[PDB]
Amino acid sequence: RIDPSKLELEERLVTVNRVAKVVKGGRRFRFAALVVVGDKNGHVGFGTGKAQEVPEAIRKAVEDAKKNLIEVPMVGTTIPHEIIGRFGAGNILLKPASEGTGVIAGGPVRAVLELAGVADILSKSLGSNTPINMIRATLQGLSELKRAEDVAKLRGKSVEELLG
RNA sequence: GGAGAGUUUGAUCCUGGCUCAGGACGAACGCUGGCGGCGUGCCUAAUACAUGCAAGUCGAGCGGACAGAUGGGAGC
Questions:
Q1: Backbone φ, ψ for residue A78 (5° rounding)
Q2: Do A43 and A70 contact (CB within 8 A), yes or no?
Q3: Which positions carry the signal peptide feature in this UniProt record?
Q4: Nearest nt to the A82 alpha carbon by C1'
Q5: CA distances from A96 to A80, A84, A117, A123, A149 (A)
Q6: A127: which of A34, A52, A91, A159 fits an S-S bond (Cβ 3.0–4.6 Å)?
Q7: A48 near A132, Cβ under 8 Å?
């Protein structure tokens, strides 16, 4: 479901772009921030915010990021299975890793996976490197993940009839 | 066992090349320089080389030699 946002959230930002609109007078600027928000227990989200200022943009981005939250399975502090998330010419593979590796990821992917609470990720972006579409690609790859308990419940099966 | 970033625009998303962050040398150059261990050290002209050595040995295969004096005598 929609994750109700009443938690403690850490809310760090990826980028603020300076973003123009041409009028009869000339260029009129705004600041478009996108901020990733989530506790490190499995709830992530991100949001965009636009204003004339930097801090109001970060305000609106943190609000819209708290609105849309997603869940991620944290099976053994990793992800359950390797997946490619592909939101619109941003394609990012995610492998589970062993317990020592640390989050191996680039900047906004690293922000999603650190604010997810997932600790051991092999990952790589195989597409364009805008932060917005890469964050959408990561959360596409984390929405399509599957729990072994839930897939065992899906196949009319038991967990040990899957895991061995 | 797998990290990306800058740059086409007034602003943006893609495509797209270019550029960077890494590890390596039989490396060289520049600045600098303490030792020890272990390794390596003409990549070029298979260009030309003074000098010194780098393949000799067996007298239990052989003939002749050179010394040598165990005793033997020789001239003062």
A1: -130, -165
A2: yes
A3: none
A4: B2
A5: 7, 12, 13, 9, 17
A6: A91
A7: yes
Beta bridge partners of A46: A36
* Cβ neighbours of residue A153 closer than 8 Å, sequence gap 6 or more: none
DSSP-based three-state secondary structure for A164: coil
Rounded Cα–Cα distance for residues A139 and A43 (Å): 11
- The technique is cryo-EM
Whether the CB-CB separation of A70 and A143 falls below 8 Å is answered with: yes
Query: Which nucleotides on chain B have any atom < 7 A from a protein Cβ?
Result: 1-6, 10-15
Q: Which amino acid is at A160?
A: E
Q: Residue A101 class from Cβ within 10 Å (0-12 exposed, 13-18 middle, 19+ buried)?
A: middle
**Nearest nucleotide relative to A97: CA against C1':** B1
* Residues across chain A: 164
Measured CA to CA, the distance from residue A35 to residue A16 in angstroms comes to: 9
